[model samples]
Target: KKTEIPSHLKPFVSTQHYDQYTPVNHAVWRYIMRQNHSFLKDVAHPAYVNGLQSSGINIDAIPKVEEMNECLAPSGWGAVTIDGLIPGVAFFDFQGHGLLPIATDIRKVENIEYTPAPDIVHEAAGHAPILLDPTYAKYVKRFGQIGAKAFSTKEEHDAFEAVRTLTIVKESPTSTPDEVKAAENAVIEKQNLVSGLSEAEQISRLFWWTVEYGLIGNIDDPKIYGAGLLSSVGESKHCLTDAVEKVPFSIEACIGTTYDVTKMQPQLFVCESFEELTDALETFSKTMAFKTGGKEGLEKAIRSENYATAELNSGLQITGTFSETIENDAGELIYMRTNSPTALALHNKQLANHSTSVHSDGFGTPIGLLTENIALENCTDEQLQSLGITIGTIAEFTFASGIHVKGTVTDIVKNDKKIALISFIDCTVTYNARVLFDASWGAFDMAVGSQITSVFPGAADAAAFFPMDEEVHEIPAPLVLNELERMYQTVRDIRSEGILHDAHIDQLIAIQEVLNKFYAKEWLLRLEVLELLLEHNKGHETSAALLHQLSTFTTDEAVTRLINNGLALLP
Candidate 1:
């Protein structure tokens, strides 16, 4: 039997719904990957190339999270899929668990070079490779646990909404100058409203200056390391030039600095190495609220609406109440999730048999529970209205960020109880309680194939990432020929492990499958190109060894020979 992907594969790779990506979408993927790979070679991080190789991100199309996880699993890392921007708790918690949250959508062509918003390109291609380094991955994990945790600020949430709205307007296929101008103004107004800044801002800014826009190596020999810079073609190249300032990496300096999303950054922090940054973050950790709060503080916040979170001694943030649960034989609640109508299902109950729990909207809401264990964190007026929760709009109130958000609504949740909207009218409350949301079930799967492809494809030989094999060509219409050429180079460059073990098997297989699929597709497309070439052929088809035929479906020897000619798959 032809080798097939296993059924209950251990280390049980998280599933990726790869089929979601279509040919056109995959086509766009090919372009971005090709583009980013072309420019990032010399200018980006030195480990970037090695990371790219090791990460198992596919170059041909968007990636498969499964493949990436399998590849990265050996390195104590795994790739997870995210829809887009999520609340901070989920964002950082994913990292805390060694799960890289890859946003799945590719940007439109017009914004293909770079868009200010995060997407598949930034997360998969830009971020995943860095995990190849043990030191860097450790940093990433720690950052999620504390350093890059998205703590709350009223202004931050407002900025997020503005950013969310602005991004939609900016990336729309058709937008008016007046319309975009309006959005820009709105975003500016939202951003400026921040109550100066807080520890969240401090930790986040340091994270930004380094993790997002960080440069590493000597200031003179600095290279790109941050995923944000690594993903954006325009930003990636511009950062390398005289466009931005590359300053020495300093934790204090980075923490104090704020950034602008509307334009390229004027300043970026550089690190001597990943280890230095990790050490710096560890030292700096002493200053964080999470650091001070420790496990009990996080637990206390569950009841306190101020922090609006609890760590459960486990890292998982309690995403929502009424979370649909799966039970074991004795009825131990096993898995639960919170999902949204759009974007991605951004909650995880566990990872690697450990709780990596996180709530996305940990502290984005204005309302807070005055006492202990409150469940109604954030519900829109409309949603509350639809749920018939209006008349009691509040127990009458407003809200505050640092208010002690404590309460256990769970105590009131009786399975057989009536579904009644009971306002905590007589009870003490930090803000107006809105409708409570119930968590539900889902068939959530991040496609491994597409996700793996989402990461940039080009990398060094197996000496770097995968197992290199002496195995593994194509022409057609310009679109066809370019794709063929791209495919040829992509597959040619693929390095598979010589002696594969289960640890890295899936990753190695995932890439080979990509090449295999490309090889087959190229053969079909080659016929179309053959007729085009044959039309201009001084030679006839079927007479002798036709150039296109020999070039395709051939052994490594033929591939090498053909590559020696104008067909430069390896070259």
Candidate 2:
């Protein structure tokens, strides 16, 4: 039965007037199909194979969009040829009508593993079959419609992209190994909070766990459904046979897991059926309404509470009267600040003799004397007792900038068993004054000439480094690295084929040189290059000129020409 086409699926008018593929194009297509088809039988979904057969795709020649549309017309789907990757919204709109947007270009043989641009093989071989499967087709349609709906609201789209950045991107700490473990531990510690997240977030979490790195069944009987797995040749085999841990899919458990696309999957969650996926989606949707709305309301309520407290407690009201600064041993300026007296006091109290200090008091005692060189053993028991130093309290520590250490107070012993060592609060350092007072004093002692010109937490700013928190921002550096790798592979492929024209080979080398120069430059320069690449990829002519300017700076005409050509190739 043909599904009713949605309004968003109205035929797109192409402005780019181009002829059909040249003879070389068909040769390239054939080469790609022949090379990739070897691995498809085992790695690809049955639906993909069937779709290829039923759609009348020719392995020996490049098929036209009209022919593809004819085959798909009966299945309530059609094909639209695109020059390159369309914008996410536009692509989603096309999918909303059950029309698959196919890119016509074939990637050079070197880009067999991964390509920045989607090749015809990936569109026809990897995606087309899945389009034919009713359930999977429905899922794709739903995703498109939901994504389009979400995009209609800027906030919703922003939130969704934020989640995607955290869950899918490689550089995100949440997707990092150490951070994932930490997140897993956190989820275990606060299992009840899982149900409180929005439906979109939960669904994103599931999609990440299943669609990205998930396997099916066990290692011996693994079934592939994930797009990443289906698209990759080497990784699919490794996932099924490798020593990596493959576990059965669990909704709660999947939520805890994190993944990285740049690296081979370390773990995979296997599901029993598509029903499990639908069920997860349903559960997420139901739970999300509360999660999304509840947090905003809770934040407002907290602000209201803070306002009430400020009014009721006169001391809590901040007066903008204090100044803050930190000086190093050489009396050179290290940091400076200004803030309210109340805020300054809070900051000073928190910074006082805390674990961050070099001379942290042990034995849960406060050190009375501020001395830079007082070693632990030289201090008498009287001095120790006066300082309130206990076994569990940190005595001394050293830390460099950008590094943080966190640990709980495990034990506090004084005279085998003493007056203050044992208490419910003693087991945990709940109050800032109790833990930080002596620690700050220690730090003050360690930095002999350091001056506290002023001290305050400025503007109530959030903490900068959150190793444990999920980072959702897109970092351009890694994406540049991927582009470099892709470009290099394309060059290597050309060289390997031995059919590459001398001019083409020179062009590849020229591109590589540009990449190398950018790679060797300072971080700022690298950022500029990456921005230029992003712009070029986005079909902006200005970025191409900027790149050419950079190439001119190096006096390399070959590189400039290559970059210009590359920019022209982008959709």
Candidate 3:
């Protein structure tokens, strides 16, 4: 259901806001745009690519916000920069004003797979193109206006929060199956529940079911409009696969369904057109007083097994169970069972956390540190005496059930080291009864409703053991990107010498102009430009001139001098 845009929150005119971008920021923008553009051409909605091309987004450099404004101004959308994560209210207000917030940072090399926070790529690549489409732009503006109005009312906020929470957290495969079943049952159980919900709640559900995780068309020819799918590489591909169930979008069906954000969606409700979304919003907006239960019911319904769980648990367990069956047949079930619980629990927990429905809880508790003192757990008192426990050694235990236990080994006494003055330990041991490897138990332990239980380690084991054969592999030195920067300067020198023909000179100037534009925004552009030049340049006069021009114009005085020296003989 949509809320009416208040008079105060009526659409406002957006300014360029382009002066704030730095050279490095622009380089980041260009890199993100190029990378996403290359992939999105075939995969993204036709409207998205059309908008990108229509907006005149520079593939070689960062486009000025003014340039974006010029392109999207007709569609009544503009781009703006923010320091970091803007509050939901402010974000909504910006969209209400027809502006999309664009963050300026790129995901680092380590974070290329996924980032916990939104970055420039996520904003520019994920949201901006959609903003340029009139129909999509209008829906965005309406959503912002609705959000702003909803923020003013506690009831609206409460209803909205339920949808937001469900969209932000990841769902487990088992849980997702349960949720889907629950949603279907909820619809059937409470026949009028969907009809009785507030317009805002219904509309919010529609948005989540379609705009956030929905897939369009059949397996062979699927289309994506969801921001979550558009922003993700893996999910984008996953959504198109036959693995996920694609259902036709219906307001009743969508509102009755629950979603998990931690893992990829198990099922997505696909809308036939943007008109369907707007119509749903309009109809929802008209019915404000519809009676419905609060989030408690929705949560209960989501936790049911139909639309709200993930698919990984079932797949992983089947694989694990098959392996167990094989071990049983081979008479090695005892060995397999030894760490089965640990393996199963760890696997399920990892999968659950990785699910699209699981909300990241701000860099989870450090569990890896516990590995350091694992060796001490295995040491006998005699061994400890011979080689004392390292001063910084720490022994921490994490139960498969979310228990946190911390203890330290003091001095070795008799045959074993004193572990917290309670027991001497010779080796790490797993108590048979305490270990649980059943996938169902693993699912319950990591489920949202489960409570964490504290348990002290009854026995400990060697946490880490160095390889008996320690191979000393050599590490290669890092490549020098700066060297490429120097090469770009050399190109500039040759172009300045005027030794190149007219066509060669024109090509060199064009290359130099593009490089200069990108360099002005991103300092790293020099290196990229050099690399490009090296890979593409032939000894042809035109190629040589372009390469020469790029290298000669660096800001560094040393680079300038080096370029001049190299080009001195060109004329």
Candidate 4:
């Protein structure tokens, strides 16, 4: 069956194109970065302070994924972009694979103190920098590898859906308070749908405690490393101000402890060192259901008469009726296997999405995937067997990734149990055999499908995109970006009228710089800066000249609206 990325996460796959930032966008980033840096000195982990450059973060500009990769690549890791709130499973899986998922968008200026949702500051400034520590990096990666395999029940997984549905609105700059309330109200009941920690939930709680909000040092004197604290403007300070209950680090305590994401964390688990986090993880992972290496433990659970599903080491879950028992020569039970596959077994991204009730494409069946050809409701076992799928007519499976596996199905079944289990690595992935480049920026070269791929760069018949540089001429300025730039241009035009000679004159330049800082492109920022400037020199000679120029600067509706706002602010 064809499985693409989950539709919920697919929207975020809009890769970060670093060149697209509006001036106001950069200004907000600059404001937050400056605040985090200024406040975090002597308060945060030394590893974080020292690793800033290594993580490819800078002041006044949003970090680039390619640049962040530079820091992570040396440690066998890299960064990717996500738009907003993402589920826990994908978060762990990406970290496990050594690719950090960062959010590309910035928060609204008004919400600068802290955002209720994960943003660029949290993902990059808060999280990526800590990975520079070798011990902590290894610990996080291990946690991810171990955590990604932990499967939650459908209800447990819906808890994540409830969080996503509510948090997505938090990331939207245009979202109204009522809109956010409605979204929250819609999912409040669903949020209660999740209860009880499966092994996976247990692992996530540990991650939430340590990765999202962990601290280091003694409980009374802690150094913050958690992303939630690292990125927060107010809460980060509170965590160390006796507002939070700091507990000595314990794997058992951390795993068992639960907290809500909707409010400021009142408790933090503190470790003595990065090594403690890793060591504690290793100790606790022993008890995880995944430690059982084979199907024996699963068989035990299946035969216990509860019709319960047990997760296998391969990260697949098996559930079906205990139709029959298989016994060897001495009448000893060899294995308690399903007579036929009761449901699908795989839970990779797309397969997992389909297995759940929340995702739009999800079939709400955890049986994993099925052969696209088989329609379960319309077909019969005899009809399926007639198509050469006989009783126990199992075949060795090799997916597109060229990985091989054997099927466990003994006969045609009503559910996905007849389907083969596969992983992201189980298929042969094809890359572009060749690429085309465009000098013009708006469009991109087409990516086409191929029977083969060039694994090694410059491999024979390998596809790649290539671009050529040429002097582009007579391009019309961008409708929005150009208008804003031109508006700021008038201030420069006036300032260049005379060199800096007086404090009043310098104030004009300062105001123009403020406007440029925000790119004077966004409404809220543009108006805010202009309104403040109008307060100091509302009727002054320079102020009048500036106002006169702005009011007539451009015919663009947005620019006109901005001029009207500036006038309203003047006394």
C-alpha lDDT of residue 403 in model 3:
33
lDDT of each: 0.50, 0.44, 0.44, 0.55
TM-score of each: 0.50, 0.40, 0.42, 0.56
Q: Which stretches of candidate 1 lie over 4 Å from their true place?
A: 1-17, 148-150, 158-192, 293-571
lDDT of 4 by residue, 146-261 (tens): 77545555565565676677777876899999999988876777667666666666887888888889888877788988988888756787888777889888877877888887
- Deviating ranges (above 4 Å) for candidate 4: 1-13, 161-186, 293-571
Write one digit per residue (lDDT tens) for candidate 1, span 1-571: 1122222111122334555554545655665665567667778866776787688866666877767777887787777655435556456656776777776666754455556567777878888877777788888888876733334555676777787787788878799989999999988898787775555677678778777888888887678888888887667777877777888988878988878878888978888888888888888866544455332233223222232322221122322212122333554322222231111111222222111132233112222221223223333445435433444342232222222222222211111222112213223322224322212311111100000001001111112212334321011123333444444333223222223234333433343345446555233223222322333332243313334444654565533332233232211
* lDDT-superior candidate, 2 or 3: 3
lDDT of 2: 0.44
Question: Which tens-of-lDDT digit does each residue in 189-299 have in candidate 3?
Answer: 443333334333544566677656655554456678787776775677777778888888776788777676666788877776777677776665443311122222222
lDDT of 3: 0.44
**TM-score of model 4 (CA atoms):** 0.56
lDDT winner, 1 or 4: 4
Best of the two (1, 3) by TM-score = 1
Q: What would the TM-score be for candidate 1 when compared with the true structure?
A: 0.50
Top model by TM-score, which number? 4
RMSD of each: 18.5, 23.9, 23.7, 16.8
